């Protein structure tokens, strides 16, 4: 807390030296729409995985499968922390997220030995849950990595079913303000390009765009 | 389920479908109460609280 | 004696009864049942 100054060496250009060395150029980056309100994997940095997003099953589908279950629509819990689970979703099986990339590599007999329930067939419907729908989304990506044709995700599984207020506790790794990053300590590039990459135009909380080239606008004046 | 709720199961990994459980220290009839795992967890909190 | 091995016994008896009543209302919506 208390507004720690950060140990990065970014700086705005002064009022004395000319603007030079335009084979790198920082400018302010402003996109069209806000993405911070959206789901975490519906944001801007995950757009390329947009076709990898699992189809959504909703609350009413989950209540209908609670009341009237199907033999091959497998409800699977993807929550990892055993200290944060307090209730049982009906007709659910426990396959925690951090083991999924190993779990689908097993045979059916090894799946039965290492989890106590049968391995789902690749044509069976699989429905995944988590606290917010984040561990279930990564698990759905791991389930779609293998050739599983029908994989669905209930976004906000436990927190809407049981009414809890929990989270999957995703870190989203951001450097500590004592950790000095790469381009300050290094002779990987020449001194002009090193000074021109480390400069920015404005405060260092917003996003910027780095230009690899620039030509002078001779047609203005 | 009695062997699995103690400290000694930490030194064992098991098959979930058919877990062959270990020989606990309470499985031997010569074991006194001071060597019991679950009693020592209760004897610790009895002196504390 | 083997209802628990079939698709309509145990926890899935509620689905087979739900699909039986849902099949009846779709024949009741037309005049295939009420006539």
């Amino acid at each position: 807390q208390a507004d720690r100054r950060t140990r990065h060496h970014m700086m705005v250009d002064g009022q004395i030296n000319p603007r030079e060395w335009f084979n790198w150029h920082p400018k302010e980056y402003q996109p069209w729409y806000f993405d911070r309100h959206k789901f975490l994997y519906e944001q801007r940095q995950y757009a390329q995985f947009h076709h990898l997003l699992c189809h959504q099953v909703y609350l009413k589908d989950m209540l209908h499968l609670m009341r009237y279950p199907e033999p091959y629509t497998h409800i699977i819990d993807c929550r990892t922390s055993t200290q944060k689970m307090h209730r049982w979703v009906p007709h659910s099986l426990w396959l925690p997220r951090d083991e999924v990339e190993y779990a689908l590599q097993l045979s059916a007999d090894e799946f039965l030995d290492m989890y106590g329930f049968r391995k789902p067939d690749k044509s069976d419907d699989v429905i995944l849950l988590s606290h917010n729908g984040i561990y279930s989304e990564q698990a759905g990506w791991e389930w779609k990595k293998q050739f599983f044709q029908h994989v669905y995700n209930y976004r906000g599984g436990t927190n809407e079913l049981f009414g809890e207020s929990y989270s999957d506790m995703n870190v989203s790794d951001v450097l500590s303000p004592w950790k000095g990053p790469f381009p300050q300590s290094g002779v990987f590039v020449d001194k002009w390009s090193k000074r021109k990459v480390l400069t920015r135009t404005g405060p260092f909380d917003r996003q910027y765009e780095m230009q690899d080239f620039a030509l002078p606008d001779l047609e203005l004046e | 389920r009695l062997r699995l709720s103690r400290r000694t199961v930490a030194n064992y990994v098991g098959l979930i479908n058919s877990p062959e459980v270990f020989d606990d220290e309470s499985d031997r009839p010569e074991t006194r109460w001071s060597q019991d795992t679950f009693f020592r967890e209760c004897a610790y909190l009895s002196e504390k609280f | 004696c083997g209802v628990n091995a079939y698709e309509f016994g145990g926890k899935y008896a509620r689905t087979y009864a739900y699909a039986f009543e849902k099949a009846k209302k779709e024949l009741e919506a037309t005049a295939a049942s009420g006539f």
């Binding site: 055993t82 200290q83 689970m85 049982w88 009906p90 007709h91 659910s92 099986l93 426990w94 925690p96 989890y115 106590g116 | 389920r1 699995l4 709720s5 400290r7 199961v9 930490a10 098991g14 979930i16 877990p19 020592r40 967890e41 610790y44 | 145990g10 926890k11």
Partner: peptide
């Protein structure tokens, strides 16, 4: 009746797969 059996099959496998944190004792 199936929901009561399958819930006890659930929480007996959570105990088998992922063990929780062990409480404290005093070593001799």
């Amino acid at each position: 009746w199936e929901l009561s059996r399958d819930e006890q099959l659930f929480w007996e496998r959570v105990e088998l797969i992922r063990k929780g944190q062990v409480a404290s004792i005093g070593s001799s």
